[PDB]
Amino acid sequence: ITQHNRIWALYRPFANSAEGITAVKIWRRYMQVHPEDAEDFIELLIQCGLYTEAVKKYIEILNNPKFQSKNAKGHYELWSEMVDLLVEHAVDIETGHETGIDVERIIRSGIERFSDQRGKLWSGLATYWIRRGNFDRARDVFEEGITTVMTVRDFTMIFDAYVEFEESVIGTLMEDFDLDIRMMRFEHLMDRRPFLLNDVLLRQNPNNVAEWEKRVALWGDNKEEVVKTYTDAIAAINPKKAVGAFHLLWANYAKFYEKAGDLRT
């Protein structure tokens, strides 16, 4: 084994000078005994164009919990680099059940593991879908990320990426039914953005009665929406730890129902 390691160290320059598929096989044989240079093997595969092999090697390295990076590379940084490589090579890398490369499942696993950048992960998935040409999949991913963002920065980044993609699509189309549907969905998202922001704020801190009052003001003349927002604020906000203006919330609820024109209820 020690002589095999010495022979591998001696033939590493020979494998580097040989290049190509022979060097890929030599690197695989070396990683069969010494897999510490798997990052160098992935770099050589990227230099040779083996995106699927590099993705499989990264998945195998992430599956092993005892794997330590030689260059002190973080697991989150490696996952972000793999996501960026998948987004930049969404058409070059073949995705299917035969190769075992599931971009959506891996993105969901990364968002569940890293919920701080889950909105950024959804934005990256939307960018990968845009690079793959699936505009409907990118729009659905953006909608799911907007509806599942508990972070203000991640939601803002996802909304900015979706707005940039929609603006690029509108500029490309202007210079039929699908574009109109995308524009209507973007208009509905812009209309419900205050509601989504209020929901995200209530998820972060439901105790903000001032935020609930701002949401009720943003509801406007829709009386059923206004009534259900007060009932949700009643059921959600604990008065023992509320931080907004709960007494003013009951006050303008009373004002709204008085201007409605009834007294008893």
């Binding site: 203000v152 939601f155 803002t156 909304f159 707005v163 603006e167 202007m174 524009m183 953005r193 972060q204």
Partner: protein
């Protein structure tokens, strides 16, 4: 008619461009508001 149809298509394209510009301005304002809200958070 091929002349009035072209004028109607041009008017529809101008209305779509104005709507796209208004949507872009609203998206910029919403992005600024979201950045302010993120800074507040």
């Amino acid at each position: 008619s091929e002349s009035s149809t072209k004028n109607a298509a041009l008017t529809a394209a101008q209305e779509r461009l104005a709507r796209f510009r208004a949507l872009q301005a609203r998206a910029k304002e919403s992005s600024q508001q979201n950045l302010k809200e993120a800074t507040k958070e």
